[PDB]
Amino acid sequence: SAVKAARYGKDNVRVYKVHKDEKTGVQTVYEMTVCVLLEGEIETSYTKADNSVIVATDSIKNTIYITAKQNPVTPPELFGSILGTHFIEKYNHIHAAHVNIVCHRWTRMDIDGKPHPHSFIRDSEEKRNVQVDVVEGKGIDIKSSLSGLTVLKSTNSQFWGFLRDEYTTLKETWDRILSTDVDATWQWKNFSGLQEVRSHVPKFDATWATAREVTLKTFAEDNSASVQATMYKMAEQILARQQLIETVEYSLPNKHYFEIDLSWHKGLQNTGKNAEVFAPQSDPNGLIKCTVGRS
Amino acid sequence: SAVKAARYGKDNVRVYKVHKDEKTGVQTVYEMTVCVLLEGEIETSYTKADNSVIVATDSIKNTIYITAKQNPVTPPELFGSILGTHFIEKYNHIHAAHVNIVCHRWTRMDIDGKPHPHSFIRDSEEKRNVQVDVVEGKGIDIKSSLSGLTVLKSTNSQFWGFLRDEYTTLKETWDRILSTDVDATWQWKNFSGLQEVRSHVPKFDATWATAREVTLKTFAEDNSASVQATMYKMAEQILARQQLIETVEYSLPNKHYFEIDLSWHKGLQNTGKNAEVFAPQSDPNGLIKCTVGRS
Amino acid sequence: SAVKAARYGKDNVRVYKVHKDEKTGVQTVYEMTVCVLLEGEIETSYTKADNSVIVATDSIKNTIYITAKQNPVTPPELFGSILGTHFIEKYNHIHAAHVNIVCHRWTRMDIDGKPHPHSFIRDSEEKRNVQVDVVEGKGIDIKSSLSGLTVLKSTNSQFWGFLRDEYTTLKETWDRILSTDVDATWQWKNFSGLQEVRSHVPKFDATWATAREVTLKTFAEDNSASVQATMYKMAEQILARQQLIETVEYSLPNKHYFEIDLSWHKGLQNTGKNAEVFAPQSDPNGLIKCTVGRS
Amino acid sequence: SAVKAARYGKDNVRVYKVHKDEKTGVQTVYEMTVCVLLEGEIETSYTKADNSVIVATDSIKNTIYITAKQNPVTPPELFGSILGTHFIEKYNHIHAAHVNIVCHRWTRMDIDGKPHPHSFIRDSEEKRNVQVDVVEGKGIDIKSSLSGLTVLKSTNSQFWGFLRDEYTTLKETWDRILSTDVDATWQWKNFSGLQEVRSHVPKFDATWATAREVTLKTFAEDNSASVQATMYKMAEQILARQQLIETVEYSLPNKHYFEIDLSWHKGLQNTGKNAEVFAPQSDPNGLIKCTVGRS
Numbered sequence A, B, C, D: 001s002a003v004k005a006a007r008y009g010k011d012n013v014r015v016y017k018v019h020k021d022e023k024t025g026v027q028t029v030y031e032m033t034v035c036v037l038l039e040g041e042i043e044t045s046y047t048k049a050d051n052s053v054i055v056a057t058d059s060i061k062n063t064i065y066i067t068a069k070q071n072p073v074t075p076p077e078l079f080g081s082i083l084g085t086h087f088i089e090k091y092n093h094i095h096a097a098h099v100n101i102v103c104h105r106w107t108r109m110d111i112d113g114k115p116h117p118h119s120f121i122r123d124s125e126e127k128r129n130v131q132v133d134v135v136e137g138k139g140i141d142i143k144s145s146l147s148g149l150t151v152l153k154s155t156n157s158q159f160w161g162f163l164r165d166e167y168t169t170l171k172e173t174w175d176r177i178l179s180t181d182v183d184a185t186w187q188w189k190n191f192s193g194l195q196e197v198r199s200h201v202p203k204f205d206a207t208w209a210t211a212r213e214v215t216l217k218t219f220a221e222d223n224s225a226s227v228q229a230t231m232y233k234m235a236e237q238i239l240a241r242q243q244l245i246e247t248v249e250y251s252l253p254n255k256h257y258f259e260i261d262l263s264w265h266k267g268l269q270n271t272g273k274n275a276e277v278f279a280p281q282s283d284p285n286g287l288i289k290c291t292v293g294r295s
Ligand SMILES: O=c1[nH]c(=O)c2nn[nH]c2[nH]1
Pocket: A008, A054, A055, A056, A057, A058, D159, D170, D225, D226, D227, D228, D254, D286, D288
């Protein structure tokens, strides 16, 4: 037997950082969960009990904190690139670093219509994420995403004209509820290294905001023919607005809300045009994915 | 042996309701999870296998949907009171109904600065809840709450002057992070029945809003001496603003964020006045509770 | 306003302890999650920012570890009683301690048919719990429980003869699936203090084992008329076998498995006597409770 | 823009099946959660709102139930292969089916030392899983796994001789706790189609049992030099015992248990040889992966 692939590191490293403006007194907080996995010439730790090639996972944890102390942690694409580059430059035998960062929301509170200098609310479970793969001699590959964005529209969704055979019971519909949790990923063109990532820093926050805005506006405004058709419209728009993106991937569950026939009870009408009360279904759920790239 | 207490019913009943304004085209959605447990002369179902006294839990589920079809589901204090009263009036041998409702957030989307007629976002995991106990001959007892409101302030929290003995290692501090998940409950004066609950309908939403506003403003503005002192200030204010409330209860975890000493690494300064990077602690956590009533 | 009730302490304190037999080389592990909440003359910490009355929650955490170092942690009824008594004896102004312990399963591995001296498996998510309330001048109240015991029987469950009215759609049945997660609590007679708890130490593990054995055998063997009737049989037996128990409480969800009518597809028969494939329902669920005491 | 990749289907389909032996009266239950995602000539559903190419996700759900009614659901490798093959054969334009199955434990109860004919316990949260990819013209690729197997050993784990630099604080150790949740995957050689999968049916359960047995015995008996070294030993053995396996992958968290220094309290000794009470750490955790194949 032989080691075909190996990686190891530290997962679930929670990090908080505060920035304090001495002039204005305003404080800004960042909170993330970080995972770093390393690859390189480490097979002998597996096959020969040779620990000399192991950068201890505990040391990786220390490094994340030190790096956060000495560098900006925003945008996460930059922080991830700095963190990954550190490992491949510092250790001769480490040739790839894989950094995943989940950013948690701490939104500044408005108290009596004015922004508070040091108080924050977790205003959503929505996350902003990055995956950064730093590979020696091959540059920096970055996938940015948003996830956990939960939305619902109560009308202006349709689903008709699908395949019908002996396995089909679903009725065609011209008016249904559509609800989903959005997971959207945009993949950046490969960067040559840190200098290039730094050159594009302003684009990271702007592209996240664009992806979010396009997702929300398209969801709200599209008279949806299917989840498939609506998600494609979202992806097309994002690719149009940022040329440094190579692909956009969406993964959308279809979180079903079922009509409840109450006609058995005093002829109560609660279906079709009369539907007011519905049963949200926890499971099963449709799951629709697509990756959109350039012609 | 004897049955000392018994209750039974249906839990985890998910309900969605839509209101459609025909004039304006605006739609409004409500989503809840409902639990109803009944008590009464039902001991023989336990001791003698006498199912004749059992209103089937499946029938309770049907009743929740029917009641939602035929009545307002907002404010939840009203819906809960209607639902509970139904069971005690309809069934001679059922003498108490216990209704718990969790309301989920579906906040209207703003698209290009204007409110969208039929699109919504789950803008937080914060819940608004009610517990309604409807007891035959004893009226309606209602406890309203908010829960899952997660906040953090990065300064203006202190904790010093606590008891010090041979079990104490905690250092006194004049500047720390304070973060919590707020669970706040206000207990209404007993109502005589549905007519009285209906008479006070406008007070329910207003009191929820007040409790939320007081919680946020007090958290943000108090230079906190302890979680204990800050939460008391919140409760005092709520009781002052709504005379129909008898008690306010808060249950607050103290979600710790620890300093990280980095001095071992090149004399890096990251404690006290120099603290920028912290380690959020998943567990353990302080847990502070208090119930405040009138003199 | 006035403080009507207050308690505070540390929750989610994870503790592991190992016992090493020097003679045999056998090791035994215990893992628990502990919560301790205190009450006493502490109102001024809330109303006056008087921290002098506060035993810091951090100190409570330290105390749990120290107490685990210096005492047996099994049975948990004993450990909880020791821990609670410590706080009321040590601090003049603390008058009640509320200790909750969740015990996690670490079951010794069998390797090649023999018990391994130091390797363990989490063989179930089932917990053994205690709630110990130690109140100055009022002794020690202990509630022992098991929870998270998930079982299913595929036949020998019935449900017929329930109330039928205009809210009822449920069909009577003489053969259904019954599945539940068992939560069973037995309440001990009040103990005068630690000496008395110590006097009964052997009864704690024995009564837990009896409660578990009775629950499993009754579930498996009863041709169940309802969840209500089966759970009463369990409680009756436990009370018969341990005279120091005052009450037994069961809380059982009815985790529904629905028939799937497949007759629309080539006349496939999958209902009644022909039912083979079912749809487990995540929600809603029945919830049945009862507290059984002595005549 | 163009569709680069697309797949869609139904996730979280819960399925239960019962087998009833008419001769012996013994019943056997199976419970699974199934996901099926399809690929093929479906791009126009995304780009042109052409639903004619969509096999509705609801129909996929129906198909899972029908297929479970008409076929064995064990071993899951077989059921998954049948289910996947159905979609590629039935629909001309569907060219790949991706089937994921999670099998839940329902272990027959022993009552008074004898196996009960129709009562079961969820004796662990451990799962047995399969991923089956059925691709038209390319056969059937099967990855079998176990996951959620949680183990702990209290001694006979070491970790010393790792890299030490200015980022390192971890002390070398010759005696520590090792605890992990095992995720182990074995990848079968490609099968040409259903006939070949059927030919190997007995090997599936046997290989699962072997993988489990090897994992447990190796964990218990290895005087572990590192997680890396121990996991390699496991993988090597599995590959030796089943020639139809091409690779074995392990993913193991290192769930840390920290010593607690209590020396500040009355010189209490609880470190090194005196360590009895430890603090289990919820996060962060080491994460160690490896894929082992043949020379
Ligand atoms: O077994 C281990 N492997 C590692 O890579 C490691 N790093 N810290 N502790 C460790 N333990």
